[PDB]
C-alpha cells in the first residue's frame, strides 16, 4: 500500500536553514518522480518542481529555481526540499507526492500518491506592541437608524491581542476581525461596533486593546468627527 | 521505468 | 501559455449538479492531459480525474470531466456535503520544451446549508491621529457573507491601485457566515492627491464599493 510521509510542522526565525522531509512506502523509490507543491497562505497550490531519485536529475518551475533544493537519499527512501536561508514568504504549507498513475506500461503523469503536508512558518519579526488608532462614525443622528464606530490596532507581534470596549461594559453589535499578518510580518486588526446614531452625542465609547506580550494596553476614546 | 514522462497523447519526454 | 483559469467560486445546494470550468492555452490544456484534484479540509489533494476524463479508480460515477479546445470541465452530479471545498484543474505544460506541471487557481465550491447572504461592506479613512503621525490607513471590514469567499480591489479615483493592499482570507463568523477585512496603506500625501478612494467587493459575481474623500 502506497503512502508518503512528511516530516511534522516548522516554526523557525528568517535566516535559519531547514530541510523537510517525504518517507515513501510501498514500491520502488528510485523508479519515480517525486513532486514538490507549495500552498501560501489564502491561495491556490502551486508546482515548485520534481526530482528523479534514481538518477538525481530535476526540474524547477522557474520561479523555485535557486531559491530551494530538492535531493533524496536512496538509503532511507526519504525525499528532501531545502532552504539554506529561510524567508518569511517562504511560509506555507508543502505537499510532497508521487509522478504515478501507471495508466501504461511505461512512464508516469499524475501526481497518484500525496504526503499529508508539512507547514512551515517563518518570521522576521520581533515583539511590538500595536499603535491604537481611533475609526470615527460617519457620525450624526440618521435615519439609516445606527453607526459604525471602532478601533484600529495597528502594527503588533506576535498574537494575541484583546479589545473590550467601554472595559466590557458592551458587546451588543461588536465585531472585531482576525488580523492581517503583513509583509512587514506583523499584524493589525479591528474591532468595530455598530450604535445607535442617537447615542453619538451622549454615550462615550472606549476600545480597550490588551497587548500581553508587549505589556501595551490601551482606551482610545473614539468620539465622532468635526 | 517510470522515468518516462507522458504529456499528451503520442507524447512524452525522458523518453531515452 | 503556462497559466489555467478558473472561477474563484461555485455552488450548489445538496443534489443539485455542478460544472467547474478550467480555461487554458495552446501549450496546455488544448493538446495536453488535463487532470483534476479535489482538496478537502485536513486531507492532502485527492487525484479525480485524469487524462482529460477517466476517472480514477475509487471515484464515484458522479464525477465527470470532458474538455473542447483550450477549455476544460469537471462535473459533480448528486452533489453532498462532504464534497465542498476545493476543486483544481491541471495539466502539462510545453512553452518550455518539457514537462512542466500547472496548477490552475483553483475553485471554492461551497454546498449550500443557508440561504446566499450578500456581504455588508464598511470603510474607514485614515484617522486624524494617523495622520499626525504621517501615516495613513484605508479599512475595509466585510462581513455577513455567505458563500465565504470574496474579491477586493483598490480603486484610486477610477484607477486600480496594486501597492499597499493587505487582504485577510474569510473566517467563519457565530452565525456560519464569512468575514474578512482588506487594508489599504498610503502616505497622507497619497490620501490627499486623489478625489476618493474605493474598496470593491465582489461576492458570487455581484460587485459593489464604498468610496471615502479627503473632503
Given at each position: 500500500?502506497?503512502?508518503?510521509?512528511?516530516?511534522?510542522?516548522?516554526?523557525?526565525?528568517?535566516?535559519?536553514?531547514?530541510?523537510?522531509?517525504?518517507?515513501?512506502?510501498?514500491?520502488?523509490?528510485?523508479?519515480?518522480?517525486?513532486?514538490?507543491?507549495?500552498?501560501?497562505?489564502?491561495?491556490?497550490?502551486?508546482?515548485?518542481?520534481?526530482?528523479?531519485?534514481?538518477?538525481?536529475?530535476?526540474?524547477?518551475?522557474?520561479?523555485?529555481?535557486?531559491?530551494?533544493?530538492?535531493?533524496?537519499?536512496?538509503?532511507?527512501?526519504?525525499?528532501?526540499?531545502?532552504?539554506?536561508?529561510?524567508?518569511?514568504?517562504?511560509?506555507?504549507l508543502?505537499?510532497?507526492?508521487?509522478?504515478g498513475?501507471?495508466?501504461?506500461?511505461?512512464?508516469?503523469?499524475?501526481?497518484?500518491?500525496?504526503?499529508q503536508?508539512?507547514?512551515?512558518?517563518?518570521?522576521?519579526?520581533?515583539?511590538?506592541?500595536?499603535?491604537?488608532?481611533?475609526?470615527?462614525?460617519?457620525?450624526?443622528?440618521?435615519?439609516?437608524?445606527?453607526?459604525?464606530?471602532?478601533?484600529?490596532?495597528?502594527?503588533?507581534?506576535?498574537e494575541?491581542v484583546?479589545?473590550?470596549?467601554?472595559?466590557?461594559?458592551?458587546?451588543?453589535?461588536?465585531?472585531?476581525?482576525?488580523?492581517?499578518?503583513?509583509?512587514?510580518?506583523?499584524?493589525?486588526?479591528?474591532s468595530?461596533?455598530?450604535?445607535?446614531?442617537?447615542?453619538?452625542?451622549?454615550?462615550?465609547?472606549?476600545?480597550?486593546?490588551?497587548?500581553?506580550?508587549?505589556?501595551?494596553?490601551?482606551?482610545?476614546?473614539?468620539?465622532?468627527?468635526? | 521505468?517510470?522515468?518516462?514522462?507522458?504529456?499528451?497523447?503520442?507524447?512524452?519526454?525522458?523518453?531515452? | 501559455?503556462?497559466?489555467?483559469?478558473?472561477?474563484?467560486?461555485?455552488?450548489?445546494?445538496?443534489?443539485?449538479?455542478?460544472?467547474?470550468?478550467?480555461?487554458?492555452?495552446?501549450?496546455?490544456?488544448?493538446?495536453?492531459?488535463?487532470?483534476?484534484?479535489?482538496?478537502?479540509?485536513?486531507?492532502a489533494?485527492?487525484?479525480?480525474?485524469?487524462?482529460?476524463?477517466?476517472?480514477?479508480?475509487?471515484?464515484?460515477?458522479?464525477?465527470?470531466?470532458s474538455?473542447?479546445?483550450?477549455?476544460?470541465?469537471?462535473?459533480?452530479?448528486?452533489?453532498?456535503?462532504?464534497?465542498?471545498?476545493?476543486?483544481?484543474?491541471?495539466?502539462?505544460?510545453?512553452?518550455?520544451?518539457?514537462?512542466?506541471?500547472?496548477?490552475?487557481?483553483?475553485?471554492?465550491?461551497?454546498?449550500?446549508?443557508?440561504?446566499?447572504?450578500?456581504?455588508?461592506?464598511?470603510?474607514?479613512?485614515?484617522?486624524?491621529?494617523?495622520?499626525?503621525?504621517?501615516?495613513?490607513?484605508?479599512?475595509?471590514?466585510?462581513?455577513?457573507?455567505?458563500?465565504?469567499?470574496?474579491?477586493?480591489?483598490?480603486?484610486?479615483?477610477?484607477?486600480?491601485?496594486?501597492?499597499?493592499?493587505?487582504?485577510?482570507?474569510?473566517?467563519?463568523?457565530?452565525?456560519?457566515?464569512?468575514a474578512?477585512?482588506?487594508?489599504?496603506?498610503?502616505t497622507?500625501?497619497?490620501?490627499?492627491?486623489?478625489?476618493?478612494?474605493?474598496?470593491?467587493?465582489?461576492?458570487?459575481?455581484?460587485?459593489?464599493?464604498?468610496?471615502?474623500?479627503?473632503?
Amino acid at each position: 500500500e502506497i503512502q508518503l510521509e512528511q516530516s511534522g510542522a516548522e516554526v523557525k526565525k528568517s535566516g535559519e536553514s531547514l530541510k523537510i522531509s517525504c518517507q515513501t512506502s510501498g514500491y520502488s523509490f528510485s523508479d519515480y518522480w517525486i513532486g514538490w507543491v507549495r500552498q501560501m497562505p489564502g491561495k491556490g497550490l502551486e508546482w515548485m518542481g520534481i526530482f528523479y531519485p534514481g538518477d538525481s536529475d530535476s526540474r524547477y518551475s522557474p520561479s523555485f529555481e535557486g531559491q530551494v533544493t530538492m535531493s533524496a537519499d536512496r538509503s532511507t527512501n526519504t525525499a528532501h526540499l531545502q532552504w539554506s536561508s529561510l524567508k518569511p514568504s517562504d511560509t506555507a504549507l508543502y505537499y510532497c507526492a508521487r509522478l504515478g498513475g501507471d495508466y501504461e506500461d511505461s512512464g508516469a503523469d499524475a501526481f497518484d500518491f500525496w504526503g499529508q503536508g508539512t507547514l512551515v512558518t517563518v518570521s522576521s519579526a520581533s515583539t511590538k506592541g500595536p499603535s491604537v488608532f481611533p475609526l470615527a462614525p460617519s457620525s450624526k443622528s440618521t435615519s439609516g437608524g445606527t453607526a459604525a464606530l471602532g478601533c484600529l490596532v495597528k502594527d503588533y507581534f506576535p498574537e494575541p491581542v484583546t479589545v473590550s470596549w467601554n472595559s466590557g461594559a458592551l458587546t451588543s453589535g461588536v465585531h472585531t476581525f482576525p488580523a492581517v499578518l503583513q509583509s512587514s510580518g506583523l499584524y493589525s486588526l479591528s474591532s468595530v461596533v455598530t450604535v445607535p446614531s442617537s447615542s453619538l452625542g451622549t454615550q462615550t465609547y472606549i476600545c480597550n486593546v490588551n497587548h500581553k506580550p508587549s505589556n501595551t494596553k490601551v482606551d482610545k476614546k473614539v468620539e465622532p468627527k468635526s | 521505468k517510470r522515468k518516462r514522462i507522458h504529456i499528451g497523447p503520442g507524447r512524452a519526454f525522458y523518453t531515452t | 501559455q503556462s497559466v489555467l483559469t478558473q472561477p474563484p467560486s461555485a455552488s450548489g445546494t445538496p443534489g443539485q449538479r455542478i460544472s467547474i470550468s478550467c480555461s487554458g492555452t495552446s501549450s496546455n490544456v488544448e493538446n495536453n492531459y488535463v487532470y483534476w484534484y479535489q482538496h478537502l479540509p485536513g486531507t492532502a489533494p485527492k487525484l479525480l480525474i485524469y487524462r482529460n476524463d477517466h476517472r480514477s479508480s475509487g471515484i464515484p460515477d458522479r464525477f465527470s470531466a470532458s474538455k473542447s479546445g483550450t477549455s476544460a470541465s469537471l462535473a459533480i452530479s448528486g452533489l453532498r456535503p462532504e464534497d465542498e471545498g476545493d476543486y483544481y484543474c491541471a495539466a502539462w505544460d510545453d512553452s518550455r520544451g518539457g514537462p512542466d506541471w500547472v496548477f490552475g487557481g483553483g475553485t471554492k465550491l461551497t454546498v449550500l446549508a443557508q440561504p446566499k447572504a450578500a456581504p455588508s461592506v464598511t470603510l474607514f479613512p485614515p484617522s486624524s491621529e494617523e495622520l499626525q503621525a504621517n501615516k495613513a490607513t484605508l479599512v475595509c471590514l466585510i462581513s455577513d457573507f455567505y458563500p465565504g469567499a470574496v474579491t477586493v480591489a483598490w480603486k484610486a479615483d477610477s484607477s486600480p491601485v496594486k501597492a499597499g493592499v493587505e487582504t485577510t482570507t474569510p473566517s467563519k463568523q457565530s452565525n456560519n457566515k464569512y468575514a474578512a477585512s482588506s487594508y489599504l496603506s498610503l502616505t497622507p500625501e497619497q490620501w490627499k492627491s486623489h478625489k476618493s478612494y474605493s474598496c470593491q467587493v465582489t461576492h458570487e459575481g455581484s460587485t459593489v464599493e464604498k468610496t471615502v474623500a479627503p473632503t
